[PDB]
Amino acid sequence: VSIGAKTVPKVSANQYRVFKIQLPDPNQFALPDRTVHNPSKERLVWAVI
Amino acid sequence: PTPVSKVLCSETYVQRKSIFYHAETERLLTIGHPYYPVSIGAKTVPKVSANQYRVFKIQLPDPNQFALPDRTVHNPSKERLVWAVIGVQVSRGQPLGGTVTGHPTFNALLDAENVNRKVTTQTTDDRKQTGLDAKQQQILLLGCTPAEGEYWTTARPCVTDRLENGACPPLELKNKHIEDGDMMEIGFGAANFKEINASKSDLPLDIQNEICLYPDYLKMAEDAAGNSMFFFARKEQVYVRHIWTRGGSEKEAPTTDFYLKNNKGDATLKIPSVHFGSPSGSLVSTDNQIFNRPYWLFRAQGMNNGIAWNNLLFLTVGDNTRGTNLTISVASDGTPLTEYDSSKFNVYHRHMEEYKLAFILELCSVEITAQTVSHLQGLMPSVLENWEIGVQPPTSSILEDTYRYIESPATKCASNVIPAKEDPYAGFKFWNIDLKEKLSLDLDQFPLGRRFLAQQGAGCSTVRKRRIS
Amino acid sequence: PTPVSKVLCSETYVQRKSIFYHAETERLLTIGHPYYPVSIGAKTVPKVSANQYRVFKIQLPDPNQFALPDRTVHNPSKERLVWAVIGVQVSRGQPLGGTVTGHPTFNALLDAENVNRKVTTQTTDDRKQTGLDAKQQQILLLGCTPAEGEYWTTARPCVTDRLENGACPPLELKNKHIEDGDMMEIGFGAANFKEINASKSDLPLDIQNEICLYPDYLKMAEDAAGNSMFFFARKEQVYVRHIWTRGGSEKEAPTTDFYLKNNKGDATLKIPSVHFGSPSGSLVSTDNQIFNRPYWLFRAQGMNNGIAWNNLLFLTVGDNTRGTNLTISVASDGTPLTEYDSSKFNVYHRHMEEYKLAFILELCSVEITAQTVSHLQGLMPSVLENWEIGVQPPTSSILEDTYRYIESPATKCASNVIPAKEDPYAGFKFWNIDLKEKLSLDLDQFPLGRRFLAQQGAGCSTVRKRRIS
Amino acid sequence: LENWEIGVQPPTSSILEDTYRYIESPATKCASNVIPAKEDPYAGFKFWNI
Amino acid sequence: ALWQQGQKLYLPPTPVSKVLCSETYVQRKSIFYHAETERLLTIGHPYYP
């Protein structure tokens, strides 16, 4: 719809709400130890459970 | 147990891990008319001068909220992690040169000259076009809280009434913090001139109507925290270059005990006798400028040796050394001029400043013992809050509304947005530099890293190009 | 010592004794007009509907002030006793059936029919008498604090002005607690319709002008305490049964890109195009209804596995399943009618709902260690007061002045009036069920006791009437 | 394999790229130049971003 | 600090009224019987006599 010079999103009950859940990169995070993966051996990621 | 009675030193409850990070900001540019904000059409042009304390808020990535791939990483409820600066290297990229400033119609009746004709009674106007070179200086500071400045203003005059319209305003000192677009000190005392120059002819046009701050070093050296400044450097030379005289009518002349009258002369002196000199900036060198020189902070001057409390840093860096204005000339018609007219070429005026920021933060875990925890109550109210140490409910646990397209007339207005916890320094504003992602862990990679390891001894690149001569 | 910053599950500082009690409320009845409060003479008739959350406040007998025949009972200053629910069995006594609701003059222009004559321009009125079956559902939830609901309302519009008189109101979500006479959700979104229906033809007459709540399950699942709900059950089926159309003038029709005009037709569409369906509840069964079924609570969904903090319980039970209205017909003269007139018999309208409540509380002693004591400060402000742990300054050591015949004029006036202290939940109101005396210790005696011991294994009566077929 | 930094000519970090303040000013160049920074791939299509 | 008045405190009385479960005084022999009624019919107008 359009009232004035603004809009009104057509929000229906029949539309695939598609979320992009953007994550916090797991590779650039604070490592307070040594057992944390070695810098060049491997990279960390996320896995949904 | 809350037996605390005296300020303590941050090293005592702060554990320093042996981890380092490199936070490099991408080069920042800003350009514009330095003297005052311009307005073409319905848009603006920030008044970007060479005499304004660029004050960066380097917002950090909260250390506490990070990925722990192990157990030796601090236990969840014992200790908290923070940031600690070790190295800072502010890089200034621009061609060296001197800063100049002037004004269309300045107020200067006469100067220090012996063979100049006799002073003509002041005409309706005596103003002239005035050149006035900046008073060269440089100020670099880092800390936790914004740096404080001092200035002079007019203090409310008392009820006692012996007042007149031309009566001299009382004065008084005032503190304030230093924001992003403040004025550097160019030759004249610091004050919100707005109430001191009612003539509009007393200042260089760029500085006028704006407040001149200064570093209240005294105040900074007194705060227990020391949050005000981790360290700091300053280099500034100046000296008189001309000597002038204001052109205002006098409400107070030198009594007859100082001024001896002459034949056919006048009983009282009428021409004003204010002699202010024009500030002069010293020649600038390739060695005098304090920049591009990594500063290793080994011990701060306060009980806080560089702890980024609140995951925040304040960089107050100002220098009129780099800056030089840039002229331009566009044809008033769009076609190269075939003949030389005084009306055809429009003179434009732009100045451009560029910075870079680099930090060598390290990880450091503060213990959370009943005693030390307590202690911070009096050191700071706020860091104990975000940290999640004491609160009614987890911020996350609470559920709050959030809309999509909050600008839609279907939805409520944006003002309601204020309910979420609000940044404290929102009233004041300054350049906001985000470093949440441009942060790494490989020292070798970056410029300031090698520069670091070099000094350390773990160097694949030692800083030595020995020159004999 | 005050170290803790995150909540601890209630089991850790709560000792469970092995004692049980049986609290059975005597059957409760209430009767009245299904739709709105009536008024005959100078008395009233509560509008008792089948679509209102009966919310009981089951006030308990303070545990910490009981009888202890032994030394084994907790030491006077180390520990405190409370109540913990284990079993709840809400019994609903009435004949099963479906709930209906209607309205004298509803707003429905036309329906989903293909052989119906063409739509006549809306006349001055198009309302008709409307039947509308209830959207069958059932909700039960026990907890410490009143359950929270959500609804839609109109949020103040902005200063920005592009307003008109018929302009649609902005909307926004709001929370509230659920009180005794609130409305169940019947087919339409939840909102204080009072500001949404300016037509009086948009709702079923019973629901209109009243607020429709809903269970904000999301909110309940987020509270650390979990006080909001120990457990809960819900069963609700619905589906469209007819499809209708409002009868209001339109401020926004489908643009020409959707609606294709026809010969001799009109440029813009004028008849409103709102298609809301009417929801009819699915057939109700003897097995679907969730009641008379003892609920053994073994682990709550929060850190509070059923602790009656503040010696208080909240039972929010609503279902439109049991309810069916009751008609009546009295002769308008008091004498049986000899002939059948349309004026002689006055139709009356009474409906009646009945409940029962049964709990299997157990005794449980919370320790009172400096640490655990402290802990509750952030869990709840109020239950500490019941404990009496907090200090109250010795100010009865200030000598105030009493007087004799404070009435005498010479004597002080004594005009000031002490103000009675408010209760925690006095602004809101709900059914108040007192259980301070109707509580016991002999499990075998009551209905829900055998039902309990049966499951336990200590049974004189095991719940088994095995049927083979 | 790219973002991860496993194989690339130079660290993105290493490059010094321009960035202005008040890029909407008329003193400064327009926002279109903003595209040079690495661009999200799904930018043509759009969806709720959480 | 001073001696004040607290609300009434409880006690457990004796109804000495426990009911008993009939199995306790009832012995069950192991004998069984089968009582079958012959089919019953009734017919008529349901609405009214």
Side-chain angles (χ1 to χ4, degrees):
Chain A
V1 174
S2 198
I3 69 153
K6 305 165 190 173
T7 66
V8 186
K10 85 99 168 194
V11 170
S12 173
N14 304 229
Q15 318 183 323
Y16 304 80
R17 294 305 154 189
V18 166
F19 307 127
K20 180 179 60 180
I21 303 60
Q22 189 173 192
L23 293 180
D25 172 290
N27 187 215
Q28 293 177 335
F29 271 60
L31 327 188
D33 301 330
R34 298 309 195 170
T35 300
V36 169
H37 61 270
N38 199 185
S40 303
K41 293 184 175 71
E42 71 281 5
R43 297 294 181 192
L44 302 178
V45 299
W46 282 137
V48 269
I49 301 157
Chain B
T2 300
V4 177
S5 60
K6 299 181 180 180
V7 57
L8 203 61
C9 293
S10 60
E11 180 180 1
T12 301
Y13 50 66
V14 173
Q15 283 317 327
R16 299 208 135 189
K17 301 287 197 160
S18 38
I19 300 68
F20 303 61
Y21 286 74
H22 174 95
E24 165 171 50
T25 78
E26 297 308 337
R27 73 166 62 196
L28 325 168
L29 320 181
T30 44
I31 77 185
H33 180 90
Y35 292 93
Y36 51 90
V38 174
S39 198
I40 69 153
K43 305 165 190 173
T44 66
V45 186
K47 85 99 168 194
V48 170
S49 173
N51 304 229
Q52 318 183 322
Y53 303 81
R54 294 304 154 189
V55 165
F56 307 127
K57 180 180 60 180
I58 303 60
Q59 189 174 192
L60 293 180
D62 170 291
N64 180 203
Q65 186 173 355
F66 271 60
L68 327 188
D70 300 330
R71 298 309 195 170
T72 300
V73 169
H74 61 270
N75 197 194
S77 303
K78 293 184 175 71
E79 301 179 0
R80 300 295 179 169
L81 302 178
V82 299
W83 282 137
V85 269
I86 301 157
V88 189
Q89 195 226 312
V90 177
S91 204
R92 295 229 48 195
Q94 270 306 30
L96 186 65
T99 292
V100 180
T101 175
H103 182 282
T105 70
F106 198 71
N107 169 41
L109 300 177
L110 300 177
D111 60 359
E113 172 70 6
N114 304 11
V115 184
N116 62 344
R117 183 191 181 182
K118 300 189 175 186
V119 186
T120 312
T121 304
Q122 318 172 2
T123 301
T124 301
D125 194 328
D126 345 287
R127 303 160 156 182
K128 324 196 169 198
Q129 225 190 318
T130 297
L132 177 57
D133 74 321
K135 168 246 175 173
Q136 186 173 355
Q137 180 180 0
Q138 314 173 313
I139 303 180
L140 180 57
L141 60 57
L142 181 74
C144 220
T145 322
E148 284 175 43
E150 42 180 47
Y151 61 172
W152 296 101
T153 68
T154 308
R156 32 89 184 170
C158 323
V159 177
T160 180
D161 198 299
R162 300 296 180 187
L163 309 169
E164 288 175 14
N165 300 353
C168 187
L171 279 159
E172 169 182 51
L173 185 85
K174 285 198 167 185
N175 283 31
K176 179 180 180 180
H177 317 94
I178 302 196
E179 312 192 314
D180 195 328
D182 304 332
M183 287 288 93
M184 181 60 60
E185 183 280 335
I186 356 165
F188 318 161
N192 53 345
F193 286 170
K194 309 178 171 191
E195 315 185 321
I196 296 305
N197 180 1
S199 291
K200 299 296 183 181
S201 60
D202 285 27
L203 313 163
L205 180 57
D206 60 0
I207 201 291
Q208 150 171 51
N209 169 63
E210 300 300 0
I211 303 180
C212 250
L213 279 194
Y214 195 67
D216 180 0
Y217 299 116
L218 302 189
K219 186 75 175 171
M220 316 296 243
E222 200 182 45
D223 301 303
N227 287 12
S228 290
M229 60 180 180
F230 300 90
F231 75 111
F232 81 82
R234 70 175 139 170
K235 267 185 180 180
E236 71 200 299
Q237 293 177 153
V238 68
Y239 68 116
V240 298
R241 173 150 166 180
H242 285 302
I243 321 181
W244 310 328
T245 48
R246 297 303 174 178
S249 184
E250 298 189 304
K251 288 292 186 177
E252 52 182 305
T255 300
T256 64
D257 60 335
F258 284 126
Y259 160 65
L260 176 60
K261 183 177 178 178
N262 64 297
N263 235 311
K264 191 177 185 176
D266 305 320
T268 300
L269 281 169
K270 296 173 187 175
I271 291 286
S273 60
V274 177
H275 308 286
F276 72 89
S278 73
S280 180
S282 180
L283 60 57
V284 63
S285 65
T286 29
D287 59 284
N288 242 275
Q289 60 180 0
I290 63 180
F291 297 93
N292 324 161
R293 322 184 154 215
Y295 281 121
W296 303 121
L297 182 72
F298 285 79
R299 292 292 174 187
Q301 60 180 0
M303 277 53 87
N304 180 190
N305 57 176
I307 298 312
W309 282 145
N310 260 332
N311 303 167
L312 211 52
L313 283 184
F314 274 76
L315 198 45
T316 314
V317 177
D319 73 286
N320 58 349
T321 298
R322 292 308 193 176
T324 274
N325 300 175
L326 186 45
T327 59
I328 306 182
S329 65
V330 202
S332 58
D333 277 26
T335 301
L337 317 172
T338 296
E339 198 146 43
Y340 177 72
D341 291 307
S342 14
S343 61
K344 303 294 185 177
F345 62 106
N346 306 156
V347 168
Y348 274 161
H349 216 173
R350 304 302 179 181
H351 180 90
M352 329 144 261
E353 303 289 16
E354 165 179 44
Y355 307 82
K356 183 178 179 180
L357 300 177
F359 307 74
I360 294 294
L361 328 178
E362 71 166 299
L363 206 58
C364 41
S365 56
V366 318
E367 293 177 350
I368 303 301
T369 302
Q371 158 169 36
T372 66
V373 177
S374 147
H375 174 73
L376 292 152
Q377 287 299 2
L379 180 57
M380 60 180 300
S382 38
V383 68
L384 295 183
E385 198 158 43
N386 304 317
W387 232 355
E388 302 180 350
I389 68 168
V391 177
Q392 299 64 10
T395 180
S396 180
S397 178
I398 303 180
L399 180 57
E400 51 172 53
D401 308 342
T402 301
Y403 297 73
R404 192 177 155 220
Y405 310 143
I406 295 186
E407 299 54 41
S408 174
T411 301
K412 64 179 180 180
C413 268
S415 60
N416 289 337
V417 177
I418 303 180
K421 300 181 60 180
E422 64 70 18
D423 58 343
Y425 311 76
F428 332 113
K429 98 297 169 182
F430 29 77
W431 199 320
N432 213 166
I433 302 180
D434 185 311
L435 284 183
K436 286 182 194 167
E437 311 184 327
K438 295 180 182 297
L439 180 57
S440 176
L441 175 61
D442 293 21
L443 290 186
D444 182 32
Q445 292 320 327
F446 312 79
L448 181 51
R450 285 177 255 73
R451 248 300 175 173
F452 177 103
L453 301 178
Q455 186 173 355
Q456 185 64 60
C460 100
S461 169
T462 306
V463 179
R464 259 308 168 183
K465 60 180 180 180
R466 299 180 180 90
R467 60 180 180 180
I468 299 290
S469 188
Chain C
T2 310
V4 177
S5 60
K6 60 180 180 180
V7 57
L8 180 57
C9 345
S10 60
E11 180 180 1
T12 301
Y13 50 66
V14 173
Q15 283 318 328
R16 300 208 135 190
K17 300 287 196 161
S18 38
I19 300 68
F20 303 61
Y21 286 74
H22 174 95
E24 165 171 50
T25 78
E26 297 308 337
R27 73 166 62 196
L28 325 167
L29 320 181
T30 44
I31 76 185
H33 186 60
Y35 302 81
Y36 48 89
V38 174
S39 198
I40 69 152
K43 305 165 190 173
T44 66
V45 187
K47 84 98 168 194
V48 170
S49 173
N51 304 229
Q52 318 183 322
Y53 303 81
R54 294 305 155 189
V55 165
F56 307 126
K57 180 179 60 180
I58 303 60
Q59 190 173 191
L60 293 180
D62 170 290
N64 230 167
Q65 198 181 303
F66 249 58
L68 323 175
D70 24 8
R71 290 295 182 186
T72 296
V73 171
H74 71 270
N75 194 182
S77 306
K78 293 184 175 71
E79 301 180 0
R80 300 295 179 169
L81 295 174
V82 299
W83 282 138
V85 269
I86 301 157
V88 188
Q89 195 226 312
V90 177
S91 204
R92 295 229 48 195
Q94 269 305 34
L96 186 65
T99 292
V100 180
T101 176
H103 183 281
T105 69
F106 198 72
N107 169 41
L109 300 177
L110 300 177
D111 60 359
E113 173 71 6
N114 304 9
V115 183
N116 62 344
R117 183 191 181 182
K118 301 189 175 186
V119 186
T120 312
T121 304
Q122 318 172 2
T123 301
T124 301
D125 194 328
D126 345 287
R127 303 160 156 182
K128 324 196 169 198
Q129 225 190 319
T130 297
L132 177 57
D133 181 65
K135 168 246 175 174
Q136 186 173 355
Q137 180 180 0
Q138 313 173 314
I139 303 180
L140 180 57
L141 49 113
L142 181 74
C144 220
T145 322
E148 284 175 43
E150 43 180 47
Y151 61 167
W152 295 101
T153 68
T154 307
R156 66 184 182 277
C158 336
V159 177
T160 182
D161 198 299
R162 300 296 180 187
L163 309 169
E164 288 175 13
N165 300 353
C168 180
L171 279 159
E172 163 178 2
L173 184 86
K174 284 198 167 185
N175 281 33
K176 179 181 180 180
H177 317 93
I178 302 196
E179 312 192 315
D180 194 328
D182 304 332
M183 288 288 93
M184 180 60 60
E185 183 280 335
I186 357 165
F188 318 162
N192 53 345
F193 286 168
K194 309 179 171 191
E195 315 186 321
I196 296 305
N197 180 359
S199 291
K200 299 296 183 181
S201 60
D202 285 27
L203 313 162
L205 180 57
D206 60 0
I207 201 292
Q208 151 171 51
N209 169 64
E210 300 180 0
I211 303 180
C212 250
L213 279 194
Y214 195 67
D216 180 0
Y217 300 116
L218 301 190
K219 186 76 175 171
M220 316 296 243
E222 293 177 350
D223 301 303
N227 286 12
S228 290
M229 60 180 180
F230 296 161
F231 75 111
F232 81 82
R234 70 175 139 170
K235 266 186 180 180
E236 70 200 299
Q237 293 177 154
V238 68
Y239 63 89
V240 298
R241 173 150 167 179
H242 285 302
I243 321 181
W244 310 328
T245 48
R246 297 303 174 178
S249 184
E250 298 189 304
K251 288 292 186 177
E252 52 182 305
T255 300
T256 64
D257 60 335
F258 284 126
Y259 160 65
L260 176 60
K261 183 177 178 178
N262 63 297
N263 235 311
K264 191 177 185 176
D266 305 320
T268 300
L269 281 169
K270 295 173 187 175
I271 291 286
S273 60
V274 177
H275 308 286
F276 72 89
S278 60
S280 64
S282 180
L283 60 57
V284 63
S285 64
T286 30
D287 59 283
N288 242 275
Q289 60 180 1
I290 63 180
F291 297 98
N292 324 161
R293 322 184 154 216
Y295 282 120
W296 303 122
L297 183 72
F298 285 80
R299 292 293 174 187
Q301 61 180 1
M303 277 53 87
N304 180 190
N305 57 176
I307 297 312
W309 282 146
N310 261 332
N311 303 166
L312 212 53
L313 283 184
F314 274 76
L315 198 45
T316 314
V317 177
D319 73 286
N320 58 348
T321 298
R322 292 309 193 176
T324 274
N325 301 175
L326 185 45
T327 59
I328 306 182
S329 65
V330 202
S332 58
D333 277 26
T335 300
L337 317 172
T338 296
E339 198 146 43
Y340 177 72
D341 291 308
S342 14
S343 61
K344 304 294 185 177
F345 61 106
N346 307 156
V347 168
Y348 273 161
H349 217 173
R350 303 301 179 181
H351 156 117
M352 329 144 261
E353 302 289 15
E354 164 179 45
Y355 307 82
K356 183 178 179 180
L357 300 177
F359 308 74
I360 292 294
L361 328 179
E362 71 167 299
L363 206 58
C364 41
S365 56
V366 318
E367 293 177 350
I368 303 301
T369 301
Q371 158 169 36
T372 66
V373 177
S374 147
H375 174 73
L376 292 152
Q377 287 299 2
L379 180 57
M380 60 180 300
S382 38
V383 68
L384 300 177
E385 180 180 0
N386 300 0
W387 291 172
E388 299 300 0
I389 63 180
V391 177
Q392 308 81 35
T395 302
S396 55
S397 301
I398 303 180
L399 300 177
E400 62 301 335
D401 312 1
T402 18
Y403 287 82
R404 287 228 294 160
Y405 327 104
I406 347 173
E407 319 321 296
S408 180
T411 299
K412 183 178 179 180
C413 248
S415 60
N416 60 0
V417 297
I418 303 180
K421 180 179 60 60
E422 181 81 332
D423 189 31
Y425 312 80
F428 332 114
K429 61 300 180 180
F430 29 77
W431 200 319
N432 213 166
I433 303 180
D434 185 311
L435 284 183
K436 286 182 194 167
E437 311 183 326
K438 295 180 182 297
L439 180 57
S440 176
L441 174 62
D442 289 345
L443 290 186
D444 182 32
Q445 292 320 327
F446 312 79
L448 181 51
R450 285 177 255 73
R451 249 299 175 174
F452 177 102
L453 302 178
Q455 186 173 355
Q456 294 300 320
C460 241
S461 168
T462 305
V463 179
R464 259 309 168 183
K465 60 180 180 180
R466 301 180 181 90
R467 60 180 180 180
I468 299 290
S469 188
Chain D
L1 294 183
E2 197 158 44
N3 303 318
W4 232 355
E5 301 180 350
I6 69 168
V8 177
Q9 299 64 10
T12 180
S13 177
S14 178
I15 302 180
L16 204 52
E17 51 172 53
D18 308 342
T19 301
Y20 298 73
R21 192 177 154 220
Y22 310 143
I23 295 186
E24 299 54 41
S25 175
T28 301
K29 64 179 180 180
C30 268
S32 60
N33 289 337
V34 177
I35 303 180
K38 300 181 60 180
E39 64 70 18
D40 58 343
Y42 311 76
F45 332 113
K46 98 297 169 182
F47 28 77
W48 200 318
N49 180 1
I50 302 180
Chain E
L2 43 69
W3 292 81
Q4 193 39 13
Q5 309 295 227
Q7 194 39 22
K8 298 191 164 186
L9 62 80
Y10 315 90
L11 300 177
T14 335
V16 131
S17 179
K18 301 301 290 187
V19 62
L20 286 284
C21 338
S22 60
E23 180 180 0
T24 301
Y25 50 66
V26 173
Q27 283 317 328
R28 300 208 135 190
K29 300 287 196 161
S30 37
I31 300 68
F32 303 62
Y33 285 74
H34 174 95
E36 165 171 50
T37 78
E38 297 308 337
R39 73 166 62 195
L40 325 168
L41 320 181
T42 44
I43 76 185
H45 180 90
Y47 292 94
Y48 51 90

